[PDB]
Amino acid sequence: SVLYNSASFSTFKCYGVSPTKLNDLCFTNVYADSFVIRGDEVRQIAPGQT
Amino acid sequence: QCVNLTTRTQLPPAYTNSFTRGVYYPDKVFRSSVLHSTQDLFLPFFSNVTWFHAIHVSGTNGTKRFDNPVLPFNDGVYFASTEKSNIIRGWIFGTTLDSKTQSLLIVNNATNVVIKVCEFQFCNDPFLGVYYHKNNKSWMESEFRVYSSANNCTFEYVSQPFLMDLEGKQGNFKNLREFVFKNIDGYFKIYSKHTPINLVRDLPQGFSALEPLVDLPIGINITRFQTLLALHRSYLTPGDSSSGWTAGAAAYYVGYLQPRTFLLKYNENGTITDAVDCALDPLSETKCTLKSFTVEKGIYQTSNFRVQPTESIVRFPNITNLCPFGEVFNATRFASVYAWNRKRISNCVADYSVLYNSASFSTFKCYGVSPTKLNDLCFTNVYADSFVIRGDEVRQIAPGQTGKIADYNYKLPDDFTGCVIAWNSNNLDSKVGGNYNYLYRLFRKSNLKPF
Amino acid sequence: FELLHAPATVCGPKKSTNLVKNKCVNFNFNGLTGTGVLTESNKKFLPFQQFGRDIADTTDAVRDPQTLEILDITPCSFGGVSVITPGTNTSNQVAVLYQ
Amino acid sequence: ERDISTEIYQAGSTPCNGVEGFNCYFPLQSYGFQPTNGVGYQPYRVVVLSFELLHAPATVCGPKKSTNLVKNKCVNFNFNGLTGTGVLTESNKKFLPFQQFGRDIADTTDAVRDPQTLEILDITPCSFGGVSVITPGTNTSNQVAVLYQ
Amino acid sequence: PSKRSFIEDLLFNKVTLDLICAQKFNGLTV
């Protein structure tokens, strides 16, 4: 919570889990990806979205 | 480090009935006094498993087998070793088994359980070697010839030290060590089981379940593997390194997993004691349908079936309506740049594919659509345009591209579904005295609208 | 190119494959998709009629576009499976019935 | 899945064999990024977080003040996200070392392993029941009896 | 061939018991 509150990311939306609830749940071995894309593609990453 | 051995004797492979071994705990949830039906990777019951045994047959030119071949991995492996003198030692997993790709290595080198995933340049005949010294009557590890190099690697684990016996034991095989290796979703899952037995060959008919041990987070591609044996060198094996050796008696069995559905019986302590394979024979299918190990007498409806279709045919009306599409291209005379001709095509069948490859244009490029896709879609009131330019305007003539006055004459739309088909014309548009027939625009008052 | 303004006028460069009968396969006659046995027919169509039907709107006939012939439709055989057992206590044999 | 292969694209019916000739394109193409461009040209840094659940003992999650353990009185609990209510008591069903929690016929959890002290506990939902009223009729009187079943 | 009496024949011919293949298309068995 406090992490993304300060960072002020422009694009942020979470699927299948609420961002406010994220502090409560417990996971196993969270992954993290990272790359750089063109502007249009930033509005083009989503599950089942061609 | 390589010592590629000799003196091997040829022998056909041997196969064995696997009986009902190979059941493991598929989930980490306690259950008691229930029957659970689940589908997963299991070893099918009563399957032919490959039996590789290392033994030195006495006599003149006796059968000397040192079987450490490359075995495909497929989708999982069941590996059961029957042992009395500690010959089977470790496993090597990979795809190309050289420095080009990562290669997992598990080894039990008599002191630690060493797990590495390093880009080893593995030898053709990797092994470890135990030397027996006659005076002290002691057995000691002496050769470690597995990998020539080790680089570019991330995971590594080493366990606590121990001192393992290395004596060559006579008699009969008595220890049974059986393992299951799976590779799912970046996880290398290992299951194991250990039991005292007494048998000279084959597998015991007793049933046993296998308990998870570790799930290594590796995430490497694996398609082949190999096992490692501990050979014996002493005064009884004269010769060089390649021939002066003998192999202690050992045997291991390899079986392959397949996706199957099992009915598993949990006891009151939660240890799996029985299982039923739901695709072995009609009786087992009935047991799985009825969800019990006991069925009374009668007739039971158990499944359905169908005759699977074997081929597929597609029939469409005989095509007899060709297009004049190729006729506009075969134009004896081309129009001017400003007076670019527009052709309308409708009530026909698009046939771009044959024209594309056969003509072999100099500059064929298309944006936003593939030619094959163009055959699989529809268009309404197809339009065709053509003109003549020079070499430099070819770069200029493009979607969303500006340029000179001639480029401004025919401005492509910024968003325009179309693509360029240009070809050179030197043997037909060249005149020794100068071809002044065609005229263009070099200076214009303003620009022009698209199309 | 343009679209979504009028009924389509140029479409579908279509390839055709050979015809097989007496073995149930996937078929496609002018977009009529399905599976089954193709066989010769005796029912006669009027010149403009493409494919027949039954009381329950089941396609039990078709006309081949190229050779102008009437073929039937008869599904791949299927049925239930039954196991006759004398009891797991008494014996371990079974007899299988395909219905 | 990831792909770093760099081989000549061969859509056309011509064997390129790494010639980069006609109808032999190179499938991987480069961006062009300059600050003086359009509104949609600016590069974006995308970071995708991915989770997975109910596959192992929990190892990554937030900092909540773990409280003391109270038993024999049915209270709210939260064991690694497995929320619920019920009586917690000592368990006699032995767990194998790799097993975490047990379930029942109805796929309901009735046993858990304590993440801190590494001990097994039972979960039995609080006592509950139905209530019935015995009445002689408001025409006669207004006394009633209650039956807990 | 079937040892049925006269009245049984008269009763069997008054009740009329392809529709079966049409219904057989979608996994309906009798």
Add this chain to the structure above:
Amino acid sequence: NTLVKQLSSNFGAISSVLNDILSRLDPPEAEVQIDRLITGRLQSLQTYVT
């Protein structure tokens, strides 16, 4: 007969033919159409059983 006739009904889907929906629609949009057809036919079968 009626149990068969219920097959030739959209039940709110785009097309009553199961294959023709998936032939011209992406997976995660056609999923809801197939899920509507499934429950329609399931109710039409439950009625006959009762």
Add this chain to the structure above:
Amino acid sequence: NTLVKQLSSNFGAISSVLNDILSRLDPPEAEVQIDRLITGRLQSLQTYVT
């Protein structure tokens, strides 16, 4: 026993436990999931009563 076993199906939701759905979702996004689960269990209970 069939009723009890039917109690633990997905019916189209993400998971079959109401507590799990409530734990990781905002009510505006959990309402539809819970609605699907409710209609499934309601159909099951009506079948049992009949």
